[PDB]
Amino acid sequence: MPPSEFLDKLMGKVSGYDARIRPNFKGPPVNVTCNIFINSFGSIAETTMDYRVNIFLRQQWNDPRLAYSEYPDDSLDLDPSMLDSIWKPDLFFANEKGANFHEVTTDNKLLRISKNGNVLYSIRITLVLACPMDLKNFPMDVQTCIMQLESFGYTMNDLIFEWDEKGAVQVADGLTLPQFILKEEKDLRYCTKHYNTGKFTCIEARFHLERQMGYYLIQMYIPSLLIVILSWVSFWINMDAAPARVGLGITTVLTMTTQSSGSRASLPKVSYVKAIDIWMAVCLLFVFSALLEYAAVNFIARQHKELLRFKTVEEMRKLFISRAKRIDTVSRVAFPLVFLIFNIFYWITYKIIRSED
Amino acid sequence: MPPSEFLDKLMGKVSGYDARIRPNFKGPPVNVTCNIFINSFGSIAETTMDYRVNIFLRQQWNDPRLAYSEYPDDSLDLDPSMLDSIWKPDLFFANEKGANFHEVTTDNKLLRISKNGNVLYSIRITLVLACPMDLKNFPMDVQTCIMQLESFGYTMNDLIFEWDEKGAVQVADGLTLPQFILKEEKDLRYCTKHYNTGKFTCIEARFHLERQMGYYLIQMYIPSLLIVILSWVSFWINMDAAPARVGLGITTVLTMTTQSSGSRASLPKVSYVKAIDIWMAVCLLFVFSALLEYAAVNFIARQHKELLRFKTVEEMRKLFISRAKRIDTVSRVAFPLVFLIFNIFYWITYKIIRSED
Amino acid sequence: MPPSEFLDKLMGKVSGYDARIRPNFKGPPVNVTCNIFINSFGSIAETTMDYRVNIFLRQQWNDPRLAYSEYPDDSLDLDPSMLDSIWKPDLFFANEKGANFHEVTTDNKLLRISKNGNVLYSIRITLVLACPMDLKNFPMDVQTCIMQLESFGYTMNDLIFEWDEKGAVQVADGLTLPQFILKEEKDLRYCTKHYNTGKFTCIEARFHLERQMGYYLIQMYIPSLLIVILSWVSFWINMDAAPARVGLGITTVLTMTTQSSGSRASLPKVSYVKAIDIWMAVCLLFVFSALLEYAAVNFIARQHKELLRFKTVEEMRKLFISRAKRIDTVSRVAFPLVFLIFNIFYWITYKIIRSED
Amino acid sequence: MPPSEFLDKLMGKVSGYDARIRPNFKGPPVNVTCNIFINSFGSIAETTMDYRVNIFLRQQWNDPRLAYSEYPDDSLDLDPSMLDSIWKPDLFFANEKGANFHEVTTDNKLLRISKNGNVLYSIRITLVLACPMDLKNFPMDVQTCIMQLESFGYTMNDLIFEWDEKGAVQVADGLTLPQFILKEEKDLRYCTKHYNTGKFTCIEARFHLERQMGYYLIQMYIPSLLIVILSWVSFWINMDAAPARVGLGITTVLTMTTQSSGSRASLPKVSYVKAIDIWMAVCLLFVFSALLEYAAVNFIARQHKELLRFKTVEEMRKLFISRAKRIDTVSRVAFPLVFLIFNIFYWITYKIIRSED
Amino acid sequence: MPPSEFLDKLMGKVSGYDARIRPNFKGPPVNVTCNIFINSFGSIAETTMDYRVNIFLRQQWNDPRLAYSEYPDDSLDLDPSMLDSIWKPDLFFANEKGANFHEVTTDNKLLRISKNGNVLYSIRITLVLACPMDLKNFPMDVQTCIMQLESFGYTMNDLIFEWDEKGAVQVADGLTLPQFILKEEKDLRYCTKHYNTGKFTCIEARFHLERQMGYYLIQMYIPSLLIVILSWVSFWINMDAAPARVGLGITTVLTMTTQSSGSRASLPKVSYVKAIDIWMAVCLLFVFSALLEYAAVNFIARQHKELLRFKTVEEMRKLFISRAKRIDTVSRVAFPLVFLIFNIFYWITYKIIRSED
Ligand SMILES: *[C@@H]1O[C@H](CO)[C@@H](O)[C@H](O)[C@H]1NC(C)=O
Ligand SMILES: *[C@@H]1O[C@H](CO)[C@@H](O)[C@H](O)[C@H]1NC(C)=O
Ligand SMILES: *[C@@H]1O[C@H](CO)[C@@H](O)[C@H](O)[C@H]1NC(C)=O
Numbered sequence A, B, C, D, E: 001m002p003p004s005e006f007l008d009k010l011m012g013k014v015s016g017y018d019a020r021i022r023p024n025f026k027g028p029p030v031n032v033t034c035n036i037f038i039n040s041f042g043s044i045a046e047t048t049m050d051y052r053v054n055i056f057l058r059q060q061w062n063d064p065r066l067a068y069s070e071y072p073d074d075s076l077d078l079d080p081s082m083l084d085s086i087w088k089p090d091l092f093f094a095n096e097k098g099a100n101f102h103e104v105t106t107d108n109k110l111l112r113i114s115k116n117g118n119v120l121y122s123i124r125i126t127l128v129l130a131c132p133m134d135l136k137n138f139p140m141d142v143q144t145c146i147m148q149l150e151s152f153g154y155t156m157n158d159l160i161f162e163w164d165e166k167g168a169v170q171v172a173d174g175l176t177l178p179q180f181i182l183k184e185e186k187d188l189r190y191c192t193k194h195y196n197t198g199k200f201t202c203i204e205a206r207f208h209l210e211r212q213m214g215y216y217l218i219q220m221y222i223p224s225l226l227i228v229i230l231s232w233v234s235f236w237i238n239m240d241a242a243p244a245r246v247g248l249g250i251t252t253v254l255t256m257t258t259q260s261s262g263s264r265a266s267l268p269k270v271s272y273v274k275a276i277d278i279w280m281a282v283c284l285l286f287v288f289s290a291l292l293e294y295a296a297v298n299f300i301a302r303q304h305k306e307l308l309r310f311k312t313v314e315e316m317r318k319l320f321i322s323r324a325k326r327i328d329t330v331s332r333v334a335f336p337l338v339f340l341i342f343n344i345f346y347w348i349t350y351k352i353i354r355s356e357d
């Protein structure tokens, strides 16, 4: 038998196969099963609020028509051109941008027709989808990105979309992301859509991403910590040289604020206060406080010199010098402990919060 | 009865349905009713002066022709391909950029034909529209963005566009914007368009947006305030160390001006003066003034030392030292009160202005 | 009479109307009149050297053919599809980039055919055109942007383009630009084009734009002026504290140069020197000079102390102290006047120059 | 004989050549040989993680059909239009983005048909491909970029892709890259692909790139080194002037941290620590240490002055002054040697590592 | 005679003119002459390494067929639609990106057919081409950009491309570039291309560009020079105030390095060292040296004070003070001369190098 004659006889002009009519017309809804494979992942940034993912989509649906039953081979592979003739289920994404088809040399379309008439439709597309990311705790957070598939033109009746029981979602082997760690759970659930026009079927896929904490520490935590240590050490020493101390304090504050502003640049603007903000604020507060401590000591010293200028003045010389020294000596030991205890408190609360969430 | 034979018989070659002729030709204008649903909102920035909104557009118009009256089911769903054959009303937007149709797998088009011949036409498109935003008061403002729909090719006679009395505009459930809060009023009004060629119908939709004040405070108000406090405190203490004071003042001024310039970067250039500008200017003025106060005190001290170099000089020693001290002592208490009163005045006037507008 | 039969009879297969033949073939050139309406203006920046303008273009030309003379109504509105059949005059822009047609729902095309056969062709397009902007005086300048329309395929003979005597160019009501003020003159002139291939008709439209001076003052003039005042005041006071003075001078210079470099960033690079450059250079020169004045005074003081170390030395003590003081006292009063006179000179010359140009 | 009659007779309606049927149907897989020539290379950046390469692709496959055997000339050149009629093997790239065909004047397609029926298919395309670059050692690294060719629609059976034994990959003469040096090895290997649908043939090409070290030294190594030298020299001198020393140290630290942050900007974020990070950290540590050394000396000096204020005090004057001087004198000579030895260690270990890898 | 009947008779179905056959088949190669006119030039930047040029391309080739010889007029103008029917020579560019055709209202195509059958084909296109720019000497350099035209599908035999003897390349009148000055030489040469497939004809056009030196001086040379002068002057004065001197030196160095880094930003990274780099390095070296000179003087002064603390000490007081003063006095006069001589040497060598190259 010739292949060409069969190929046109099955889906051509002699065949009553109209691509405008749904299969099993005036009948029970056509069940469609969807299998998704992730070729690659990437392009995730906070400002953009979207992720670009390359995916291979497989759609399988039963067709009573086109059941030739005259060829020994179980299935027949077919060309991309043949797909236009066949009836195709509509697919839409709830948050779809871009998604242009790849057409290098030939369109990337695969058609397989089984003897029973089950049809496999395969396409490769790059989807950019909006992700409603959570910016609550910037250093450590878990982000879930959801992909939703709906039927734009058909109601719940006459077309139902279902997930594949085994191997519904696959991922490319040895695929990694520089910023996030993908979690191997991939929970899938389906939520129907209600509109004024009607009720439309939908299915959802959920992906969990974990941030890598390594970059943030080196980029932000380490410089701030070194700055804080420098300020404290320098402030405690060179007490007699008051211009030297005040100049150091002010420069340290200026660097702290500029660094904090620099830190808040890559991410977008939100009303709520992030953990990084909290850390910057406390560090700035400590650096701020140090200068006030020096100012108080300088004021007390000024009082001592003026009164001395005014035995009766050595009656108060020991008192004022001892008081000022008692301030400096206590402050010097006191501040790192009252900083270490906060640092420990901060890390433990965030660690338990991440563990429970 | 076969579906295919009916489907071509209704809108094909045997039917005199020409897609080049308006329905009810030489007759009263065709009333078209439009329903708009907002899938998503986003991409609003001052420099761009545009907003990107994903929308679902439903157009309903009465057609005397295509009233088959031979099928028991009330309405028939139809394919996107069928739409080209049917006559379609022209739609244009007064400020339209981009707006390319989404065509993933199949074009996102829905056609529903009722027995009476009313036709529902549904399309999903992303429109970028210019918004004439008001930049009067940068921290707190209400922005209204308007969307206008007009008929490019047809005059007021032979095509009229009207709003749906109930549920004219719907919004996606649980839809939020990071920067703005959408207001649930959505006032709709229609303004006709007059041109040299003729009079064309139009309809307008108005959306109200409220800025979130949380980010601006942390980003700008808090650093400026800390800087101002540091400068005042430091200036009042370490009075004897004049190089220390002058150096602090100058560094503080330099940070103030650079921060102000940095603040004026995200937004575009306008002739009028914004509230943020006013706040930066007063803070800079206070920081500026402090240095002049120190300079005056230093000059008086210089006069005291030169005259002393010249009892007759202790006749004026008490006077000059007392005068200089009286300056420093009064200035020190005086400046925060004369700053707090302004801050209170500023916030109350802006709060009443936002409330009334 | 049926509309469809007439519509194909007028411009179809029975009609000898070939869209490949120019009307009035072997005859006098076809006069075409063009009317332009500006929907919106915007996107003007120095670096890009182009402006994006949305425009509605109306082309009117006389056609002897298609003069039906059998329908009572004076004119017939026609669909966009009908336009392809009709012969259309070629239009080109001398400096055209982009200019993609807007095609939302239906193509934005209007066709009107009068009984006499005059044809009105209407299109809406967004044109990006290069503008040869003048960057001579950055703060105040008048920019003229020219739009040129030419016939790419046809010579001067057989197609002439002319302007409409009344209402040739219209602008959208209540249309404003944030940076520039449009001038309501809109002088139109036409210049023919000569090429090796032949002579081609062209028409030109000129638009005048005036810069808003409000933003530039606040952004650049005010910070530089405050810096200059601070430097002068601080330099004159705290004369005894030489490290304090030198440190202030150097920091002030560093801010001046960085601010000047920052200023020269938004605009492109040009050989000629702009007014803003002149202002920055003089301000930098004044700030520069101040330090040299302090250095000279310090050198004289050094000479006084060394000679004193060497009555015979109080013979020269009064002379050296008086000379140094005479320098500081004169310099202090002298510099603002010699700055105010320049500022007055600068503004008056630029104001007269802008007024005359 | 006429050329036109032959040209349609060979591949037209009288010929049974259907472009929907694979050659040698129900037969051994069709061997396809691929030759690749690199027109140009460029656009390689770390953030993008992709490279843009212009390539000329030659596909040669045996066809039993179209073996005319009636023309004396060995091969016939054919037009791009003729290609659509012929059956064409599908080609896909594992990591393909963009890759739009170039179509200036005519499509860039070459067809050559030999007498035996071997067919040469030639196309020019620009491919952007993701490269999994290694960011372990930023200054010196070797990057390998892989290009993979697979058959999307056909399994391993019925289409096999093989490399050309001689001159498989050619490069344009005199082609250079500013950043990287291409290595003339170009190892080619093929790895089959296994999927749920089936087994698909693939071939891989590997390119080796070597970074140029010249820019990085001047940009980063030289400024850091000069800064370190300045800090050490300045710290050792001007020991009596403690405010001068502390101010120098702090400014030097501030520049070091800002420079380090600036350095980490061009490249993306990764968890692991790069060599440049290690170099910045040690330099910052040295600069940091210097200040602590000065602080310790200042503290000892303070102890000496307080005890002196309290012979019995000249019993300890020599001891304290000698101890402080012994610190400064040893530290001064000690630090460059303990810096030179590290620098030598660093360079030798990286040089051996690059040589072995 | 009717025009339509002739127009289809010449190039239609009755005519044996097949657009798939080369003219003069089995005959001598078809000579094609190319004329290029430059509408505009622009978009040249170092990072991009490409230039965008708008060009009008004229192709003239002899056709024996289509020689009607029955119309009195010498040449017939024809529509863009007619071009598809005619055989067209393939054109390709060696380094072509973008180059999309402009299609506003009508496609910008001109066809002219002479009586002898010579055919003129005219197209307007914007070509972005890679330019292998030389970055050896950044301030002054001459850049040559080459445009190459080749035949993708045809070998040297059967299609030859040649230049027009007179007026081969024309430029638009009054066309200027802000950065570069075009040179009116425009040397044209042709180099054949050899490939594995065959030998292909090519032609090349060379354009010479000269940089404008005005911007670079103001942007970079002037600030560096002022900084150098400030540092030298300030260092020489205020010798007794060592903290003041060291602080000035360090701040000056910090500005120098940041300015140098800022300078190296607009351009890309290259291994070789540019002239601007050389200038920055020497200026940094001078500024660096000054601090070391001050440190040496301070060390000598320290030696003098310690020995004095230890007549026998006034035996060495004169010697040490005289030596330190001799250093400062010589250094002060010595450095500008040893800077002026270098500046003169630098400019003369670059000027002769530019003149000879
Ligand atoms: C799809 O599945 C449901 C539940 O298994 C079934 O009731 C329905 O008939 C199916 N639809 C078909 C077979 O078209
Ligand atoms: C549209 O509505 C108006 C007002 O209700 C009516 O006068 C007009 O006839 C309507 N147009 C039709 C029915 O075509
Ligand atoms: C166009 O106008 C000119 C001048 O009015 C006239 O000479 C010419 O005949 C006109 N062209 C026509 C009527 O085709």
Ligand SMILES: *[C@@H]1O[C@H](CO)[C@@H](O)[C@H](O)[C@H]1NC(C)=O
Binding pocket: D024, D028, D029, D030, D031
């Ligand atoms: C391709 O090559 C293999 C191994 O040389 C051979 O077995 C096979 O038959 C070939 N395929 C053909 C000739 O179609």
Ligand SMILES: *[C@@H]1O[C@H](CO)[C@@H](O)[C@H](O)[C@H]1NC(C)=O
Binding pocket: E024, E028, E029, E030, E031
């Ligand atoms: C093209 O020119 C060459 C040299 O003038 C000539 O030999 C050749 O015959 C020409 N090709 C033609 C006329 O087709």
